[PDB]
Amino acid sequence: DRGVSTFSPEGRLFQVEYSLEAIKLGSTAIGIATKEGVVLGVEKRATSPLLESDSIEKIVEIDRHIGCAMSGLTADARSMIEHARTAAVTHNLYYDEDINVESLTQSVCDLALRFGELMSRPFGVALLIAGHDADDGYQLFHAEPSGTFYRYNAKAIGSGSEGAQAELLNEWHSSLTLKEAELLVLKILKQVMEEKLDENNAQLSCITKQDGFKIYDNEKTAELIKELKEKEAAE
Amino acid sequence: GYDRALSIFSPDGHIFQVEYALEAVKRGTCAVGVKGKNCVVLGCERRSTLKLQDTRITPSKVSKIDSHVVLSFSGLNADSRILIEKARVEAQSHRLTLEDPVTVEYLTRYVAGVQQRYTQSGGVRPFGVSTLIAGFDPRDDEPKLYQTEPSGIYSSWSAQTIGRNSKTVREFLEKNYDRKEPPATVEECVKLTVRSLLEVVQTGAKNIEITVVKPDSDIVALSSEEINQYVTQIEQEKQE
Amino acid sequence: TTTLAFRFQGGIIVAVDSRATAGNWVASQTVKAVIEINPFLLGTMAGGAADCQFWETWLGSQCRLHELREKERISVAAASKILSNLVYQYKGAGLSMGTMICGYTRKEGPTIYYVDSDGTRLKGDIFCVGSGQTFAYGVLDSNYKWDLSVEDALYLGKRSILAAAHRDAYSGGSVNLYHVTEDGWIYHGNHDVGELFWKVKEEEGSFNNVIG
Amino acid sequence: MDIILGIRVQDSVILASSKAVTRGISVLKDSDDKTRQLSPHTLMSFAGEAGDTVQFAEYIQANIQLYSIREDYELSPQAVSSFVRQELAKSIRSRRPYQVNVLIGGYDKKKNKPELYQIDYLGTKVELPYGAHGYSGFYTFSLLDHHYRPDMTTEEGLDLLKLCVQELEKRMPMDFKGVIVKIVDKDGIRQVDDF
Amino acid sequence: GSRRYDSRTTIFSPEGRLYQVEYALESISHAGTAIGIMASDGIVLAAERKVTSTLLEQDTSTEKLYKLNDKIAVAVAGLTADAEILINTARIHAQNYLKTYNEDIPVEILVRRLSDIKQGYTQHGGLRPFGVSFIYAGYDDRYGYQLYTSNPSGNYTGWKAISVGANTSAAQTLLQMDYKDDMKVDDAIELALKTLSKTTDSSALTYDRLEFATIRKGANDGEVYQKIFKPQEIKDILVKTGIT
Amino acid sequence: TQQPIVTGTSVISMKYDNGVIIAADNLGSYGSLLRFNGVERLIPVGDNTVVGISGDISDMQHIERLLKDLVTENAYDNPLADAEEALEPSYIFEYLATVMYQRRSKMNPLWNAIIVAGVQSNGDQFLRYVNLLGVTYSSPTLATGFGAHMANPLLRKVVDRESDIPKTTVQVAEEAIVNAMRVLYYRDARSSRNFSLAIIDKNTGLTFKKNLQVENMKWDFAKDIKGYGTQKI
Amino acid sequence: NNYDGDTVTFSPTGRLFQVEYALEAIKQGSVTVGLRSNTHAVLVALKRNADELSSYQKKIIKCDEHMGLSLAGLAPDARVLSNYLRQQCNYSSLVFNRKLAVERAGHLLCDKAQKNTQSYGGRPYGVGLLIIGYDKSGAHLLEFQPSGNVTELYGTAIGARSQGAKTYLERTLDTFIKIDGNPDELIKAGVEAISQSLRDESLTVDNLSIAIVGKDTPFTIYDGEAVAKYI
Amino acid sequence: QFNPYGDNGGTILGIAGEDFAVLAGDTRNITDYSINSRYEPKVFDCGDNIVMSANGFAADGDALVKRFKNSVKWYHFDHNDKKLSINSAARNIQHLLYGKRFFPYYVHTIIAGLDEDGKGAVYSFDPVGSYEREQCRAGGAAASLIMPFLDNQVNFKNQYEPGTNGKVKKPLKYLSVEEVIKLVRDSFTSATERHIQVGDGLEILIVTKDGVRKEFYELKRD
Numbered sequence A: 001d002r003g004v005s006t007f008s009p010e011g012r013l014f015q016v017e018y019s020l021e022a023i024k025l026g027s028t029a030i031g032i033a034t035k036e037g038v039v040l041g042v043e044k045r046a047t048s049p050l051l052e053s054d055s056i057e058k059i060v061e062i063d064r065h066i067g068c069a070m071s072g073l074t075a076d077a078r079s080m081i082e083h084a085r086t087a088a089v090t091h092n093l094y095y096d097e098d099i100n101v102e103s104l105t106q107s108v109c110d111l112a113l114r115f116g117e118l119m120s121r122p123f124g125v126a127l128l129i130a131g132h133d134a135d136d137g138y139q140l141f142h143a144e145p146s147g148t149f150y151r152y153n154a155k156a157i158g159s160g161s162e163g164a165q166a167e168l169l170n171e172w173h174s175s176l177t178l179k180e181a182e183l184l185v186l187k188i189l190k191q192v193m194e195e196k197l198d199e200n201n202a203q204l205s206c207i208t209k210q211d212g213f214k215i216y217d218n219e220k221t222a223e224l225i226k227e228l229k230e231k232e233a234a235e
Numbered sequence B: 001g002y003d004r005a006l007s008i009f010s011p012d013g014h015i016f017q018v019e020y021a022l023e024a025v026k027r028g029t030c031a032v033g034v035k036g037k038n039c040v041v042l043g044c045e046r047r048s049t050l051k052l053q054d055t056r057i058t059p060s061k062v063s064k065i066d067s068h069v070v071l072s073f074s075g076l077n078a079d080s081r082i083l084i085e086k087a088r089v090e091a092q093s094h095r096l097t098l099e100d101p102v103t104v105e106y107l108t109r110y111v112a113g114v115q116q117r118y119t120q121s122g123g124v125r126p127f128g129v130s131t132l133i134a135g136f137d138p139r140d141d142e143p144k145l146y147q148t149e150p151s152g153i154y155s156s157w158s159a160q161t162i163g164r165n166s167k168t169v170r171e172f173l174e175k176n177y178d179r180k181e182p183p184a185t186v187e188e189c190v191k192l193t194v195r196s197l198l199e200v201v202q203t204g205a206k207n208i209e210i211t212v213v214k215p216d217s218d219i220v221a222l223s224s225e226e227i228n229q230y231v232t233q234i235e236q237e238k239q240e
Numbered sequence C: 001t002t003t004l005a006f007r008f009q010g011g012i013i014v015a016v017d018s019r020a021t022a023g024n025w026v027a028s029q030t031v032k033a034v035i036e037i038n039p040f041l042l043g044t045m046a047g048g049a050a051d052c053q054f055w056e057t058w059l060g061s062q063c064r065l066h067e068l069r070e071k072e073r074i075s076v077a078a079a080s081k082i083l084s085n086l087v088y089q090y091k092g093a094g095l096s097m098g099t100m101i102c103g104y105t106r107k108e109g110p111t112i113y114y115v116d117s118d119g120t121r122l123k124g125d126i127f128c129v130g131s132g133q134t135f136a137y138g139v140l141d142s143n144y145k146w147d148l149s150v151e152d153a154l155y156l157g158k159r160s161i162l163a164a165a166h167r168d169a170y171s172g173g174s175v176n177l178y179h180v181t182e183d184g185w186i187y188h189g190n191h192d193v194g195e196l197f198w199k200v201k202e203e204e205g206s207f208n209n210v211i212g
Numbered sequence D: 001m002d003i004i005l006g007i008r009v010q011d012s013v014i015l016a017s018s019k020a021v022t023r024g025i026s027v028l029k030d031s032d033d034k035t036r037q038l039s040p041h042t043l044m045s046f047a048g049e050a051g052d053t054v055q056f057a058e059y060i061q062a063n064i065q066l067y068s069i070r071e072d073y074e075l076s077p078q079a080v081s082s083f084v085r086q087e088l089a090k091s092i093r094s095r096r097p098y099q100v101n102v103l104i105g106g107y108d109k110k111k112n113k114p115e116l117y118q119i120d121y122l123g124t125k126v127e128l129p130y131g132a133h134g135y136s137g138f139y140t141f142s143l144l145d146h147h148y149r150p151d152m153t154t155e156e157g158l159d160l161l162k163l164c165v166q167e168l169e170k171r172m173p174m175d176f177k178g179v180i181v182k183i184v185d186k187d188g189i190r191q192v193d194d195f
Numbered sequence E: 001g002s003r004r005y006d007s008r009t010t011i012f013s014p015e016g017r018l019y020q021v022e023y024a025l026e027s028i029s030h031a032g033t034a035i036g037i038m039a040s041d042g043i044v045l046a047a048e049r050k051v052t053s054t055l056l057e058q059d060t061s062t063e064k065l066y067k068l069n070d071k072i073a074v075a076v077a078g079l080t081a082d083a084e085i086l087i088n089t090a091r092i093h094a095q096n097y098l099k100t101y102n103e104d105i106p107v108e109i110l111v112r113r114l115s116d117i118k119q120g121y122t123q124h125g126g127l128r129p130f131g132v133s134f135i136y137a138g139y140d141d142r143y144g145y146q147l148y149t150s151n152p153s154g155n156y157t158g159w160k161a162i163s164v165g166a167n168t169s170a171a172q173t174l175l176q177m178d179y180k181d182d183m184k185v186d187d188a189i190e191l192a193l194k195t196l197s198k199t200t201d202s203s204a205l206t207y208d209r210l211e212f213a214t215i216r217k218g219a220n221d222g223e224v225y226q227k228i229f230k231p232q233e234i235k236d237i238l239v240k241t242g243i244t
Numbered sequence F: 001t002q003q004p005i006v007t008g009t010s011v012i013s014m015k016y017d018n019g020v021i022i023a024a025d026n027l028g029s030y031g032s033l034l035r036f037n038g039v040e041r042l043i044p045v046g047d048n049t050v051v052g053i054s055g056d057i058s059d060m061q062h063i064e065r066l067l068k069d070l071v072t073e074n075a076y077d078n079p080l081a082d083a084e085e086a087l088e089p090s091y092i093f094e095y096l097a098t099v100m101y102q103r104r105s106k107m108n109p110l111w112n113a114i115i116v117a118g119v120q121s122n123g124d125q126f127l128r129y130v131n132l133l134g135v136t137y138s139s140p141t142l143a144t145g146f147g148a149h150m151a152n153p154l155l156r157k158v159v160d161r162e163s164d165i166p167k168t169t170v171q172v173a174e175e176a177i178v179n180a181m182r183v184l185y186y187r188d189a190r191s192s193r194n195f196s197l198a199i200i201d202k203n204t205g206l207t208f209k210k211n212l213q214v215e216n217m218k219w220d221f222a223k224d225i226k227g228y229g230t231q232k233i
Numbered sequence G: 001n002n003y004d005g006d007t008v009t010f011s012p013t014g015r016l017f018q019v020e021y022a023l024e025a026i027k028q029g030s031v032t033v034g035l036r037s038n039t040h041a042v043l044v045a046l047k048r049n050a051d052e053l054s055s056y057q058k059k060i061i062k063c064d065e066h067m068g069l070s071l072a073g074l075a076p077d078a079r080v081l082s083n084y085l086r087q088q089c090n091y092s093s094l095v096f097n098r099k100l101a102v103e104r105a106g107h108l109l110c111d112k113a114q115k116n117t118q119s120y121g122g123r124p125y126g127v128g129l130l131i132i133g134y135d136k137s138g139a140h141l142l143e144f145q146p147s148g149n150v151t152e153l154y155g156t157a158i159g160a161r162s163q164g165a166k167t168y169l170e171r172t173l174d175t176f177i178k179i180d181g182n183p184d185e186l187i188k189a190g191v192e193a194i195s196q197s198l199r200d201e202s203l204t205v206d207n208l209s210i211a212i213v214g215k216d217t218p219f220t221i222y223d224g225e226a227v228a229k230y231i
Numbered sequence H: 001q002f003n004p005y006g007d008n009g010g011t012i013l014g015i016a017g018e019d020f021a022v023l024a025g026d027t028r029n030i031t032d033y034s035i036n037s038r039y040e041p042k043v044f045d046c047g048d049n050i051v052m053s054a055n056g057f058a059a060d061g062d063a064l065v066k067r068f069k070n071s072v073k074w075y076h077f078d079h080n081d082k083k084l085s086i087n088s089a090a091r092n093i094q095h096l097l098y099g100k101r102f103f104p105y106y107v108h109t110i111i112a113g114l115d116e117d118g119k120g121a122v123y124s125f126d127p128v129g130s131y132e133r134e135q136c137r138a139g140g141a142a143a144s145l146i147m148p149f150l151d152n153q154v155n156f157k158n159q160y161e162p163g164t165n166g167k168v169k170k171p172l173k174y175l176s177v178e179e180v181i182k183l184v185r186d187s188f189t190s191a192t193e194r195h196i197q198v199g200d201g202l203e204i205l206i207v208t209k210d211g212v213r214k215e216f217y218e219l220k221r222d
Ligand SMILES: *[C@@H](O)[C@H](CC(C)C)NC(=O)[C@H](CC(C)C)NC(=O)[C@H](CC(C)C)NC(=O)OCc1ccccc1
Pocket: C001, C002, C019, C020, C021, C022, C023, C027, C028, C031, C032, C033, C045, C046, C047, C048, C049, C050, C052, C130, C131, H104, H126, H127, H128, H130
């Protein structure tokens, strides 16, 4: 057939480029960074109404100061999360401190290109890694299966990404509050989702310095959805 | 050692070996899972192409992983034994180290993890098996029902079916299963499970297997005559 | 070193001394023989300082990983068994550890596990570990009841360490107190034996053999 | 640990095991249960080096419980005893051997017979009407040689066991803080809460 | 490199079938027919040797029926060399179990173990599967007399009467017709030979083209005897049943 | 773990104003047997370094080969091998010190005591010690074995501290070294009269002196010594 | 064509296509410039962003106090190779108490990249590196290609549109080599050199990345308002 | 039989002030009854405003310091030139020491610097990695001579206020850098008198927010 670690004539790794196509088929995930905190939100996308939606876990805690959202082949993310959690805890053991969000992201990205003929193929999932540390404050990173990671003020990944990113382009400014960011994630998720957005098929989360990483209750998100509907009807 | 990458991405972002493993599941005999208010029922299809079978000794479709958790499946029968064995070993290992039996969610997460590992490891093909894992957590009366598949994704279900003609029985369950009021009793839950299989099975003789799991390690398999009584009552009400 | 821990109505009392020695030489009077693994778990330290410190802060990393993976607080039984299974792997290599893993959970209630470098793992209501363990046992066994007030239980633990600090040459320095409840542990101060002894003697009327 | 006894009567097996745990100069506990249920009709008591005893017992327990789930069937006491012996016979030539002695009391539901097996840390198995490990046998075997019958009842077995414990409490130097007694018969395993 | 020449033996087809397993089953369908019939008082194993010669030394020959232990035997259909590899593994597994538990291995446990080995060659390793199908005839004190079959996929199932190898479709129909639950060994012997006699591709069924075996409790009191039939004994049972 | 068989005794050295001096006798002992009388224990490395080695001779010959190999390896793909990227004393020492500590940590030591004497690129004097345990130290005067006990006291009278180095000439320093070697011949039962001496100067370079002998010895007073106390004849 | 499936296969004209495809990845990468005088050596790198919300990908990596590089191509491969250099620089210091020569650092990178071009299963590195450093023989600039070829130069540039900067340096050769004891002027020349490779976009405060090493100057990286002086 | 350990003597002392910290040590290196060197530095600037000394067997001491300096270097590489805090350095050193639990570094390690609030900090280690933050700690050969003096003159132990007679303690007033250096110099002068392995010279490293300063003082050479 052909090598798994083969370069294309354009200078790109075939397998890495193909895994990026799998990520485009995944459910939408959005992240927004502010001076008051970072917000993470995902589309759950249940395949059937009999599927209990609260069991869909696409937002995940890595440590108290670092959270993570996923999009693509979500099964592949489990070993990446396990590594991230281990790396975060191990660093605390070795250095008696929290690990920098960038350093955690770098550790996860080191796994990416460890494939050949090590694992048999790249990961088919992208991650939004959000957190806080004392040095660089509130941060949001986008970790790909290429081994590359970019920092972002705001970012969307998944099937409705390029439409959502264009919306984030206009809406984001450096003086956004946490409440404003929450509504903004809900607004953009509602825009790109196939089914109508509610508290059961969408999930919010945030990371603040005081309270740390928190996944929002369905009752708490429901109120923010109702608050969104009213403010859009206000003009 | 044999290191060949069998599960790989294609230009359109698909892993065909994982997708072809799902086709093996589509071929397998139908399996269904329904959870009531205080129970879970696992229904399984037995294809009647094989008679002169010895039903005493033939491998049963529903397997006990521990005294409080069961596992049924659709797909390759030989492959399922490997997952069942690993699951049984992990169940005893969990009891040994944590001094507490596995939760249904944990056992599912393990089996799903094994299935995923076989989709990005060299020299191996994915499991051609999807499982339904059901039971009750230790000292808990809330019913649990989970599904897994070759890719390694897993999730919880109020009711679910897998295997051949699963599209039809899922159609039945989606209109007949009410979340606000699930099957309150064992009778109601078994009846709904047998009804759902009767949409697909053919004859209601030795083609339907039923296994009821209740809280506190109370697991029993219904006999032919007991199931036959449900089959009789369903059709007599249908003649109207 | 002298350490103790006991179950009672108001949860668990944990009390330790503060002395460390190298032969007859007193290396330190200000050591923490108690490690806070988490807001609900405590670990006592007796035997080798390094062995206990290293593997109990490691234990805390494993407990943190557990509640990340399982979204639930680790049981005292599971936490203790992680440590006991670890030291059993090193059995024969020369580790020196005598520890109590103390905590409270909903399913278990207040629980204490004695864990040992020999591989021993025991559940129990009362434990005293260290070179001055026998002295502490004397006071504890004669005054222990299930129906003790948090105030009276704290004093008994403090007093039991004092008894050992006095008689055992390799015990002393100061007393660290902890009280473990349904809502977590609560530190109850560092008590210098040099001041506590004279205070207790005067108020309690005990230690009449000593002159002051 | 210290004293573990076993006696096979007409229709049951009775195991008695001391409650004391002594780590050096102090008795750390006086209510320790030196036994593990391997299966519904099989019980194993144990005594030897600290740590190794519990580690070995729980390891055996896990393996038998695994077998039970896999086959949906309870192994015979004879089969369980043979498995245990092999593990100890393997262990004695290891880097660091398990320093554990055991008694295995079981009721065979197929043959409708009680069975008692004595196995030491070397992997030396013997089936017996009554057995013991350590210094216990030195006192108790003379009494059992005199008083024992194959047709004794469970109540008679407990009385003969009381006579053994009384002799041990009189002539042994160590205070073993009494014994926990457990009966194994056709109905399963139960503990005698007053002894 | 080497990838160029790899057949990839352990992959799914677009339909979700294992190529090599399916082709191995095609190989087995050309092998000599082997039949197993379970009765209340014993089990029969009958099998047809493939186009023999007059110069073949029959009395010292064995290609179909093999002994795994004193209680369990197997009938082979496929590559004989492949079967002997697995047979020696099964013989060892039975002895391992006997050494560990001091009891004869239950039939199903032995069958599951061999079937798990076959399964492994279909999922990992990149090697071709064993082109063999077994009929297991055995006895233990839990389930009594038992018949199983396993195939290259590693899947196994229990049976009252079963055939493997050539003309199984025709053979299974004939067994399904004349088999009854209250049947005895002597009757099962007659059924097995009559079925082979009708399904055989040869002109006539003779003693030199057959291997035969019975597992009977027809041993003096509560115990089980294996009887691998000799050429002269196969000749006599052929006359008795009225085939020659 | 081993035991040393064929051994070499003291190596002595000191710093002076423009460089360093090092010396060692030419003996290879086999226990009390003075077996080999032509053993060179000072091994030059380039034109700026001399490594003096005591202890096990078989291990010395091994080290000698490592240094020979080091020079070869440094020259590979190195156009400045005889200039800016030549081997320094500090490089050679640190290499040996690394090896010695690694070997002690595997419980299989090189049974030696080593002194690396040389002059750096900037003209600075280099003098450092290392032994079978991987222990290292530097001083204006360094000596191994018996030299540590007898030579150092004599050499420290010349250079007692760092400030005495610029005040010490090469003639004064060589005189002190040669005297120390005589004293060791008087008092070390495993020493020889024959020895080698090396000078590394920042101006005049490396001067390697072979076949030196201890001379101007005092023995005449022995004739007057009779008995062990009371004896007169 | 038929001879580009893996790195172990020569073409009929003696070409290694997988290596050439890896070389192509560098050309897609953002521009970076390297130049030196007798006293100092400078790296200038144009950083690239994903969009306006995103950060600008870092281009320069420190290897030691006296050595470092800038990258162009697959960033993870630069992380692997820079990690290897860090270890080799470190091995030289710990074992020999010796700062690793820049020329010898190039030789080690060449040999590491080569092994990936002659063996089955693996792949060539998909990144180009510009290594600067100050050692015992003064200032140095190296250009690394993943074919294995390493070259010592006065100045150079790699990445997209790098030919413009390379021509400018070829004209300015006699001028910038003489800029001794003046770091700011040497950077000015490097900033003016990278400007010849710009189209549409210009050098902004979070776009530009500069690094310098010299006689009494440790390898330091300048980003943000620290490079506003040179805009 | 080969003995992989040795004893190079020496003695070290760390004192933590209110906004500063000192780490002192003599410059003598010995084996048995011989002097190897009269000036062999024992206390080292490790970067990030941290000073360190590993006293006992010098080969193990040099190895450990060398490895920790290396750890600081890689901490900068791996974590974006982040400053290594004194508490994080201490935990890192524990793992270096315990990593050789079954073939130990035969040294008494002490580090000194400033904590993240700017207050003076001293950490003390045993050979297998157990550690503890302290206000005052002496290590090495003459540690038994020095520590009691420091309990008395730094923490005012067994001292009370005149007139009250044992009822009121002497208040724990803070010490300046000049006052601390006096106690250090007197400690080493006294230790030199009564311990044969102590002498030749005294080198003190002082750590403040402004950086790391050095001071050297002569000691008796007998
Ligand atoms: C009391 O049990 C106390 C508990 C700790 C929490 C402090 N332990 C000790 O005092 C213990 C005494 C035992 C070993 C007899 N002391 C130590 O472990 C001791 C601690 C230092 C800080 C004094 N360390 C020790 O003795 O040295 C270890 C060593 C020595 C020499 C060579 C290798 C290792």
